[PDB]
Design a protein around this nucleic acid. Structure first.
Lengths: 80, 105, 123, 78
RNA sequence: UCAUGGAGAGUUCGAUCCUGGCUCAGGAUGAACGCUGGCGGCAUGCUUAACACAUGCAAGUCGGACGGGAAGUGUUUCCAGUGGCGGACGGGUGAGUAACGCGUAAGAACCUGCCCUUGGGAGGGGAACAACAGCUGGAAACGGCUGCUAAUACCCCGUAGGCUGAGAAGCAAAAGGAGGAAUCCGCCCGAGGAGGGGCUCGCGUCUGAUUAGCUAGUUGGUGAGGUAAUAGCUUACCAAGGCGAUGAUCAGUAGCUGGUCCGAGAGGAUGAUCAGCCACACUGGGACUGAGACACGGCCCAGACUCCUACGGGAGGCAGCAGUGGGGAAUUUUCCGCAAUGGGCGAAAGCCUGACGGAGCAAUGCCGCGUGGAGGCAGAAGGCCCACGGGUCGUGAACUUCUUUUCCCGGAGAAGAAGCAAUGACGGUAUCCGGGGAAUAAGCAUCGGCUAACUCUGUGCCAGCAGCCGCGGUAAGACAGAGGAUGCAAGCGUUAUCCGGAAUGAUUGGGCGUAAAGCGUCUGUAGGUGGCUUUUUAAGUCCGCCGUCAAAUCCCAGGGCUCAACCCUGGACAG
């Protein structure tokens, strides 16, 4: 399926990452149905948009490694 | 040999599956060929109709045998087996459609 | 030209900005091969001996190009680098030759505006 | 979407009618309303359309190369 | 309130008004060349020959599917082979393609391994094929008999909410592995969904009439086949249709679009990097397997070309990354790393990624910063010019102090890396602290009008300049030099391409008595526009709501890099 994954969105030596739920066959910087999330590893926030991640994980788009690790920081996981 | 082949390994397996699928699709063409052949004969000159259907049904069962068996292995999608079993029973329904079984919607 | 039908057929179109250099036809300046290094005169109001090199180009044309500056090294069959720009006085000369580039030396002893003539700094 | 109502041109083909469809369109650079006609092949198993009647085209499964519509009847609210 | 936008000038003539053309002032380049050149941040880097390509690398993985063997001496690491997925993604180029290829908007006739949800099932048998051993052919590339072997590899029987058929009837499947177990990964048959594809259609999609007819599987219909699915997709017969002067057919050009640039605006030109879709992979043509290709680094054939050969034969596709050669005015390093991110495989461990993350060179571009700050008797040395009085270079310098962005010499030193720890190519980079020291650092155009800047010496229709007008025949504010000035600034100029100016293709926005231009006049087809009142539908029109026009860009507002460039978050008018 769809695989919720980051994409690099920034300058050189910056690493401002989006969390996009695109199809896994696409290149890493493509297009999404809905670009759900944010991750700034230098130091800043991470907007998550919980209902849409629950929509796609409720559908069954498995995430990658560190997207899943961000999803294990917060308490997003509910099986409903 | 070389430490990495990776594609000649494919082409080896492609040669093998070419042999198997070529062969057994040809079996399917032979058995459908015999069914339509005997149906052509009993359309031509039979003169007793509701009796000898046991042979046509027997070979047609062998046709549905190898048809659906090659539907199991991946060489025929659904709606290939559907179209060709429906083809054989279109032909059977036409040979009875000329004659003594009366069928009307 | 009404808005109806003499003009939703077409008005007309202007052609282009017509090319002011028919050679150089890719882009701005192009390597040349000297064929003649003769000298011609301008039209009637002026009076000079302007020294032009008729030059074959790498494009596929042959064209008579002007040689700027005072001194010139250009003999038969040397290599130059022509550029665009119309010398008015000479009928037919459409192009210039860059000085200081390949096999066409800079002008002798010039100390005002050297980048147009390919002369490095003195002093 | 909409249907495409329009006159029947010539029905000398079984189950098949050519239909002129007249469509107003704003011309792009100059701001009028130019009509463009475009004629289609529609399907009818009933083939109950003479020359000159006017039908409504609705998209269906393609029947031939050109025959990709079947036309039934307009509403007729005058 | 809205408005954040619109400049002229030269040249026809003894003069004037006007038409009209050319030329310039403004931006932008994927740019090129010349002169000059301190640093940093972020981008960009064959536009040409889709032209050949040396060398290395660019796609693997799985021993927890299976059999063997080979290092290590119960224990583990490997391995060619059979299998499983991945090689259809990612990367590159724009030759073709004026067409549902693309863009946008609807639709029904379909498929879909991996991914979630879900209903049921896995009994019984059996034959080999690699590997391997032997013989043997070849320089190699590869083979060829003889035997043998295992499986999630193949075959057969039974069983099936599936299929065929009107029913009658029949037909169809399985695979084990890991673990002590527990269980987990699987497998087979179904049923949905997401995503991905395959089709169809409305509308938009370059020029040329000095290309006017085209089309006979052509356009329909049926029957037979065929496709995952509709279909002249294909075939036999019947019908004569179908397209076109609103440009068919032919010829030529061109990847397309979010966008970029310009413009006040309408819109004009254009499609590099960024991103989505298409097509191609030496030139052609085929098919095979799989879910999915007619497959860049797959197979087969033909053609051309290069390499090897022991002369019989083989091998090859850089428009992957670096690189060489050619062409060109012109476009880089045969670099480091999987640390992140994203892929592929695996139960995990991990492995592989020239994608990507970085680094190097180049003022190629956009932005920021410095080359000193303050004082400097108004006295001297000098250049140039002068009615020889002087003026001007000039507070400029010299000279006195202050400071160290940068520079040199030392110390420290990151995050980026993800809560088990460990895990960094970048790199001892960024940044900070200390010690000297004005030290290490300004050029390039122009100075006749547009156009800001001017005098002097030399030249004498010569040398030359020039964007247009035109200067140059002895005192040139136009050539050459000096001084001075101007404008810019690590840039400055020339050229080329595009838009503006240009209302010089005109809807906004022009004209036709004489300046370029009314057919010689008339009839009339197509087509265009059209009197008044009343009524009806709403196609146009207008208003509300809703869907969509990907993300990035532009606009507004915040936020982050010491600011800016750039990056990021949210929002939206238009249309």
């Amino acid at each position: 399926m769809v695989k919720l994954r980051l994409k690099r969105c920034g300058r050189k030596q910056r690493a401002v990452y989006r969390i996009v739920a695109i199809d896994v066959r696409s290149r890493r910087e493509g297009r999404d149905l809905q670009k759900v999330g944010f991750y700034d590893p230098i130091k800043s926030q991470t907007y998550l948009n919980v209902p849409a991640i629950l929509d796609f994980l409720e559908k069954g788009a498995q995430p990658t490694e560190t997207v899943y690790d961000i999803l294990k920081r917060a308490e997003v996981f509910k099986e409903f | 040999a070389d430490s990495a082949a990776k594609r000649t390994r494919q082409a080896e397996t492609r040669r093998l599956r070419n042999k198997a699928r070529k062969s057994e699709v040809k079996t399917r063409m032979r058995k459908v060929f015999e069914a339509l052949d005997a149906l052509k004969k009993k359309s031509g000159a039979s003169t007793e109709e509701l009796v000898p259907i046991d042979n046509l049904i027997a070979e047609a069962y062998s046709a549905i045998d190898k048809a659906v068996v090659k539907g199991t292995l991946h060489r025929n999608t659904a709606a290939r087996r559907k179209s060709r079993l429906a083809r054989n029973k279109k032909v059977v329904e036409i040979h009875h459609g000329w004659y003594t079984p009366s069928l009307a919607p | 030209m009404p808005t109806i039908k003499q003009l939703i057929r077409n008005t007309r179109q202007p052609i282009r900005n017509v090319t002011k250099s028919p050679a150089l036809r890719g882009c701005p300046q192009r390597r040349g091969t000297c064929t003649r290094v003769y000298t011609i005169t301008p039209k009637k109001p002026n009076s000079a001996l302007r020294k032009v090199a008729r030059v074959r180009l790498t494009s596929g044309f042959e064209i008579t190009a002007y040689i700027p500056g005072i001194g010139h090294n250009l003999q038969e069959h040397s290599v130059v680098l022509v550029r665009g720009g119309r010398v008015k006085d000479l009928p037919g000369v459409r192009y210039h030759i860059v000085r200081g580039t390949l096999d066409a030396v800079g002008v002798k002893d010039r100390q005002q505006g050297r980048s147009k003539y390919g002369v490095k700094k003195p002093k | 979407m909409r249907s495409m109502q329009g006159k029947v041109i010539c029905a000398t083909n079984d189950k098949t009618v050519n239909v002129e469809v007249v469509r107003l369109a704003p011309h792009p650079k100059y701001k009028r309303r130019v009509r463009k006609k475009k004629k289609y092949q529609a399907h009818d198993p009933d083939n109950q359309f003479k020359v000159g009647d006017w039908v409504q085209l609705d998209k269906c499964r393609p029947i031939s190369k050109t025959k990709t519509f079947l036309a039934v009847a307009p509403e007729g609210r005058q």
